[PDB]
Design a binder for this molecule. Sequence first.
Ligand SMILES: O=c1[nH]cnc2c(C[N@@H+]3C[C@H](CO)[C@@H](O)C3)c[nH]c12
Ligand SMILES: O=c1[nH]cnc2c(C[N@@H+]3C[C@H](CO)[C@@H](O)C3)c[nH]c12
Ligand SMILES: O=c1[nH]cnc2c(C[N@@H+]3C[C@H](CO)[C@@H](O)C3)c[nH]c12
Lengths: 282, 282, 282
Amino acid sequence: NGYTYEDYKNTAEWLLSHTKHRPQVAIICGSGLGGLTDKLTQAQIFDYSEIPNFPRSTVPGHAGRLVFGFLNGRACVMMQGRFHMYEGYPLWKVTFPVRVFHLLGVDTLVVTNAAGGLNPKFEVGDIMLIRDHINLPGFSGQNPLRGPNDERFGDRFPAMSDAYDRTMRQRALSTWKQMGEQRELQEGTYVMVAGPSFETVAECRVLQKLGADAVGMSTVPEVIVARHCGLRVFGFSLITNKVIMDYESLEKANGEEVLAAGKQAAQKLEQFVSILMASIPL
Amino acid sequence: NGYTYEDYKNTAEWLLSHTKHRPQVAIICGSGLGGLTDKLTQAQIFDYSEIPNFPRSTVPGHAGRLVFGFLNGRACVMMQGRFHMYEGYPLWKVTFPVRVFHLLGVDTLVVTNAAGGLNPKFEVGDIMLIRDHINLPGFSGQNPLRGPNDERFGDRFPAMSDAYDRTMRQRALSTWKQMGEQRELQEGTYVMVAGPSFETVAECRVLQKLGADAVGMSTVPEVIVARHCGLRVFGFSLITNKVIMDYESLEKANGEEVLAAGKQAAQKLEQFVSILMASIPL
Amino acid sequence: NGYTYEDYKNTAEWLLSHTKHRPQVAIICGSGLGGLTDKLTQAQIFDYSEIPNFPRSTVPGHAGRLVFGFLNGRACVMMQGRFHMYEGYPLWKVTFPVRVFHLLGVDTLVVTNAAGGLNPKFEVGDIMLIRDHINLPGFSGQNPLRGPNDERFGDRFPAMSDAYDRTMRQRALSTWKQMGEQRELQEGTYVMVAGPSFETVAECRVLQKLGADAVGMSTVPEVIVARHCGLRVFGFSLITNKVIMDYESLEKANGEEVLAAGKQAAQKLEQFVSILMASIPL
Ligand SMILES: O=c1[nH]cnc2c(C[N@@H+]3C[C@H](CO)[C@@H](O)C3)c[nH]c12
Ligand SMILES: O=c1[nH]cnc2c(C[N@@H+]3C[C@H](CO)[C@@H](O)C3)c[nH]c12
Ligand SMILES: O=c1[nH]cnc2c(C[N@@H+]3C[C@H](CO)[C@@H](O)C3)c[nH]c12
């Protein structure tokens, strides 16, 4: 890890002295979900590039910013553009923001992402509440906590079986119903794979056989660092496509559609997140 | 990645100005399949060591060369000796040649390798057409495309579900029959594991349970980079041994036998490849 | 790999000239099993920090030492405190001691560790004889033999299907009975995961579906290097906890209990190891 405790501290204090905002809830916007930033009020934008120690967003579109504001009665800080292992960043950079949030005073992390559906019951547009995850990269060594542990953040061996807050998941399922929606709110296991190339049929079958319901290339690292910090964690995936699971089909998964699904059924997640803020204690 | 676009370009131009040959089909010879180089005509050999930017073959036997020539009516470039992740090379070096081939004007990549048979229906000497692959290293981060993407080669998120050209696989199965052979042409999923040590019984069972038919320590990376490039891809594995899948057996897998199987039933693959060249469009 | 053959040699010769002891059996003590060092006679302690080239134990408790002595009629060398991939050490440092032992004249390696039980038949306190292992990190590239092979230690492609000496496992099962004990001696497959965070329910299910019986974050690397060396290998796991495999449960795995289980049923393993020394040929 190239960061010392001092680095996270200096970044936090810099942000704290450059904004009057004092966030409680940190929100990481997934692909095609950045619009969520338009709902904040008293918004204050910071480009990643101007924040000390922040990983500088190479060329996804040069759009990387931290937005502080209020979302439905709660002090928030949103990440529009998140870092991925596939871009070359080691996991300790990918999750650097998370530790910064903790030092800013955040106690809750909401993570969102787009994902391929592995469970056949899913349909494009569906929203999957994350009940659990399978950290394939972590099994091999790619775990954001690798390296000496700093007691100031947490313990050497944090547990992850209760990573996704049960209370929030319940309140989430409730909220979704209180709103009265067509499709039900899906729930399941998210499996992380490094990417960036999409899965083959054989691989799709492997992930299904392991019990995963949705597949993506992010999130798990941020969740592990958040939990290591003591943060309350809740999140979901926007199923942007159904992964090909048999050779009959003659269609390919593309980053184009993922942003397209995250175009129509996108605002659906946005509203759900804003409303869900009232369900977050303080 | 330690290579800049310029590096691949300079290597291509160097080769292009040192040979009159202009290859269309690149062929990577697997273990004990190097003999395939003896079939080229108007052959011109280049030691890896003399080609700018090429990874220098440590000590597999110091035998690493790029051979340009004609194979059954087609301009080829063959790799005699391929790079493996287990030797210490990062994946961006392992696949460096592939991007060079694309800049040389190659539009087809034929990959061959020796592999352990996981499917019980296989026998030593069998030839397995590769229909799909399981990229275990890729799930964890070891994917040759990790790092910033260069649009000149391809897209950020290339698909792999159609990696192995369906047309060539069909024409391959046809060719094999047109020849009238004893054993049928096997077909299945290739699973890549890093190695270099051989699998345990428990591991063999894992790979079988995942749906893999053959196991090796190469190929998948080259295939992913080729596809990212737009190359047509086809290949197969020479089953050199049947992996031990139960504790009853008292025999061990050894690099000795692998080269031995690749001694008798070796030329069988060689001919098949030469003849298959006529089935490759232009 | 940052070590040259010379480095292992110089470390061996340094130890050989600083102790009259000439070990035959090397023993690696797992978590909460360090007490085994109290049974040696004519004991001579070396701090890891004073041994040339040894990885310096960061801050697990600053307790890292190599103890030479005699254990029940056999010249031993014990590692009190072992290195883990999760602490940041690359595998070639984690396994550095193993190659040193081989140069000291050791011909047998006994590895012990604490592990989470995946097989439901297990209970806290149980002892599991290791019959086989699943090297998840190894599938992805994290194998201690990655990099050029040195013929002086072993072959390029060593087999692992017979890693755990069948004779010792038999003599172990015998010994356990000759002693007449309540609980039977368990036996099964050990799966290595990098850690340091504990498994989620979904992950627990994956590991079970793969056929693993116990889960830990060490051992496999040392075993592979030992075998590559020609060392006889035998070992076992102390089940310190039963991994949560369903959402009903409301308890979390913690490094606290692991050391606690390794407190009561700890000496049970210690005696078993001492007595088992008589079963090790010479
Ligand atoms: O089928 C899939 N496989 C793996 N990841 C995704 C995702 C998630 N994100 C979306 C984004 C690509 O469009 C990249 O960062 C991956 C959506 N569908 C799939
Ligand atoms: O049983 C097996 N397991 C893993 N790889 C192979 C291979 C393939 N290559 C062959 C070569 C060793 O002889 C090394 O680079 C692995 C053949 N049989 C097996
Ligand atoms: O449930 C488990 N999952 C993964 N490893 C362990 C272990 C083994 N060691 C023990 C030690 C933590 O207490 C760390 O190095 C892991 C015991 N129980 C479990």
